[PDB]
Amino acid sequence: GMSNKFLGTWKLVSSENFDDYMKALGVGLATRKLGNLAKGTVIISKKGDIITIRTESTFKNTEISFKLGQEFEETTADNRKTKSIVTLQRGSLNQVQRWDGKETTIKRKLVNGKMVAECKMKGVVCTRIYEKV
Amino acid sequence: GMSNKFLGTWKLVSSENFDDYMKALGVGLATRKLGNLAKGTVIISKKGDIITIRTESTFKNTEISFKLGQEFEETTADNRKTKSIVTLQRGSLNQVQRWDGKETTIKRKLVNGKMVAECKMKGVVCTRIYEKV
Ligand SMILES: CCCCCCCCCCCCCCCC(=O)O
Ligand SMILES: CCCCCCCCCCCCCCCC(=O)O
């Protein structure tokens, strides 16, 4: 299952191409400006077979709870209403979000103790690195 | 989770566009001829959180065991070696198979007591209906 190494609290330490990724999602300028400035915190916990990923920032907080491979409704930070599925590939935690015929993916994997989130939307790619606290 | 209504033994009663689907997978003629003639039987069982789908025919038998949303290695009836994931969407059991940069999906759902499998490969679509025994 999901490695317990994911469990814990994660602090953003780097972000690459987040602006263009947001633009591709349809996020407006003023919103992107605050989205880029946000030094977020991601918290991953588990109770039974149910995994929770909570994102905390000044601007917006989010939280999703899910079982692996079981679709669920999500309200994203920019307030898209998606049908989302989280799966496990080579230890990589892969979230896909579908809405209005569109699709984006957020892949989270552990690299040398850091969590590396890679976001993909229409060939636009961003990378965000977190370190555990 | 996966509805217990899937559990049981299923007999093929109809198949539509299976030939073109096989062609799209790269299946050769003589193999397709036996693949089309095959009156298969699908058996779905569960032990804990692990689901097993066994396909039985004279020509070829197959069997896969998996957890929802967790990638696993599969050897298909035509002997492709794929990385596969099974997920749950609106009660639909969705298998995706990836190999050599390619992708195909087999979606299984229950309709009025029948199991309806829809296979997709490069816009080629097939439908196979099963009734429970
Ligand atoms: C601090 C959160 C973003 C606030 C601004 C809204 C931007 C909309 C896009 C939301 C999806 C962001 C996904 C980031 C993935 C991650 O690093 O966990
Ligand atoms: C009786 C099985 C097929 C035998 C011939 C090999 C054809 C290769 C394609 C294998 C995938 C078939 C998927 C069918 C889905 C189903 O109805 O469960």
Author numbering:
A (entry chain A), B (entry chain A): -1 to 131
Quoted passage from the original study:
Myelin protein P2 is one of the quantitatively major proteins of human peripheral nerve myelin. The human myelin protein P2 has a structure typical for FABPs, where β strands form a 10-stranded barrel covered by an α-helical lid. P2 binds phospholipids and stacks lipid bilayers together.
Proline 38 lies at a putative hinge between the barrel and the lid, and the P38G mutation would intuitively be expected to make the hinge more flexible, perhaps aiding lid opening motions or making the portal region less stable. The crystal structure of P2-P38G indicates that the overall structure of P2 in the crystal state does not change due to the point mutation from an amino acid with the most rigid (Pro) to the one with the most flexible (Gly) backbone. The fatty acid palmitate is bound in the same mode in both forms of P2, and the flexible loops at both ends of the barrel are also in similar conformations. The helical lid is also closed in the mutant protein in the crystal state. wtP2 and P2-P38G have indistinguishable folding in solution as well, as shown by CD spectroscopy. This difference of 6 K in temperature stability is also likely to be reflected in the respective dynamics of wtP2 and P2-P38G, indirectly suggesting a more dynamic nature for the mutant protein. The increased membrane binding activity of P2-P38G could be explained by increasing protein flexibility and an enhanced ability to interact with lipids.
